[PDB]
A paper describes a structure:
Thioredoxins (TRX) are small globular proteins of about 100–110 residues, which are conserved in all living organisms. They participate in multiple critical redox-reactions via the reversible oxidation of the active site CXXC catalytic motif1. Two TRX forms were described in Escherichia coli, Trx1 and Trx22. The former, called EcTRX throughout this work, is a widely used experimental model for investigating the molecular basis of protein stability, folding and function.
The L94A mutation was introduced to disrupt the van der Waals interactions between Leu94 and the Leu99 residue of the CTH, with a concomitant destabilization of the global structure through intramolecular packing defects. In the crystal structure of wild-type EcTRX, two small cavities of 70 and 50 Å2 of internal area are localized near Leu94, which coalesce in a larger cavity of 183 Å2 in the L94A mutant structure. This effect approaches what can be expected from pruning the side-chain to Cβ in the wild-type structure. We determined in this work the three-dimensional structure of three full-length variants in which the point mutations occur in the CTH (E101G, N106A and L107A), and one additional variant (L94A) where a substitution is located in the loop connecting β5-strand and CTH, using X-ray diffraction. The four EcTRX mutants were crystallized in the oxidized form, and numerous protein-metal interactions were observed as a result of the Cu(II)-salt added for crystallization, as it was previously observed for the wild-type variant. Notably, the four variants crystallized in different crystal systems, comprising monoclinic, triclinic, orthorhombic and trigonal space groups, for L94A, E101G, N106A and L107A respectively. We found that global stability of the variants is progressively altered from 8.1 (wild-type), 7.8 (N106A), 7.4 (L94A), 7.2 (E101G) to 5.8 kcal mol−1 (L107A). Previous results of our group showed that the specific activity measured by using the non-natural substrate DiFTC-insulin is 80, 95, 100, 108 and 175% for L94A, L107A, wild-type, N106A and E101G, respectively.
Numbering used by the authors: 1 to 107
The structure:
């Protein structure tokens, strides 16, 4: 968790929308087992990709306003923002290797 940005509905418009560079946003909730499984993978990705990527998390139960802005249907959903715009999307479970493939194709 040392490299994960904790987002809220109150901070999203600053920390994501006013940021240049790439930010991987994980939309999650505590009831979601696959979300909890990807959590340690995100710590590893945040470290390996530091300096070309920031990793952030938004809990959709605590912060219900953001996900509908992007039409999110279910979780996990990962949105890769580049300079305030969604540039890539991945839904559902992902292994480390699958997440690295997704990031490498988009960074
Ligand atoms: Cu950490
Ligand atoms: Cu490292």
């Amino acid at each position: 968790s040392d490299k994960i940005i904790h987002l809220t509905d109150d901070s999203f418009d600053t920390d994501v929308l006013k940021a240049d560079g790439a930010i991987l946003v994980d939309f999650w909730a505590e009831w979601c087992g696959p979300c909890k499984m990807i959590a340690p993978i995100l710590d590893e990705i945040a470290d390996e990709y530091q300096g070309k990527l920031t990793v952030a998390k938004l809990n959709i139960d605590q912060n219900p306003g953001t996900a509908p802005k992007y039409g999110i249907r279910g979780i996990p959903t990962l949105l890769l923002f580049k300079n305030g715009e969604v540039a890539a999307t991945k839904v559902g479970a992902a292994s480390k290797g699958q997440l690295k493939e997704f990031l490498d194709a988009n960074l």
